[PDB]
């Protein structure tokens, strides 16, 4: 049958099929199966498609992966970006705010991305356990933007006092958008975590799992695979190291 690949529609609005097109063509080449792109606004909805075996493969966030593993989602491979199969969250404020630390955001307005994002939510919910607080009992108000880009924009425009976003989104935005760049500062960085594993649904056969894993790990050695990687701003796919996610697994237990 069709091979269904699920992604969030909010990471790159209007540019999702443009971004994923080449890698879907690569999956078609390596599997011989017609590929359908399945989009949802929320990572909660993407995880429910995986749980119910309504899709074969998904590009999900790192906290989504820690939840999806409990219902038998299997990691395929991990993207290596800027030479690292790992990353962190950054907390950003305006240089002119007088808010120069995570601590000084107490009783301030804060933006998260998707509730199931590590770099956009769970990193900060986890760290606040240190002082027996939650976002709701630490910040004056919280808002879920479902977008690293839109959280960065809300800090820039002064709508919120702070946000947590992916480090590469921030550093790339600083280059692309020079004025937003000069207005913003990183005041806090999270611990390191593994890059989000590409996953398959629990229903997939062991032969299909091995075929897909080998295709992802070999993608950088195939001409179409190289085009797919360049388009996604990924160096290559490397083998999953389960230990890379243990900080997130521990946070999940502490809520």
Describe the protein's architecture and organization.
Helix 1 (16-31) crosses helix 9, helix 2 (43-51) packs parallel to helix 3 and helix 4 crosses helix 11 (246-254). Strands 2-1-3-12-4-13 form a six-stranded mixed sheet. A five-stranded mixed sheet has the order 8-7-9-6-10. By secondary structure, it is of the alpha/beta class. It has eleven helices and 13 strands. Helices cover 41% and strands 22% of the residues. Strand 1 (3-8), helix 1 and strand 2 form a beta-alpha-beta unit. It folds into two domains: 3-81 and 196-241, 3-Layer(aba) Sandwich (D-Maltodextrin-Binding Protein, domain 2), CATH 3.40.190; 89-190, 3-Layer(aba) Sandwich (D-Maltodextrin-Binding Protein, domain 2).
List the helices and strands and how they pair.
Elements: E1 3-8, H1 16-31, E2 35-40, H2 43-51, E3 57-58, H3 62-70, E4 74-80, E5 86-87, E6 89-94, E7 109-112, H4 118-127, H5 135-138, E8 141-144, H6 148-156, E9 162-166, H7 167-176, H8 178-183, E10 184-189, E11 193-194, E12 198-200, H9 206-217, H10 223-232, E13 236-238, H11 246-254
Parallel strand pairs: 1-2, 1-3, 7-8, 7-9
Antiparallel strand pairs: 3-12, 4-12, 4-13, 5-11, 6-9, 6-10
Helix pairs in contact: 1-9, 1-10, 2-3, 4-11
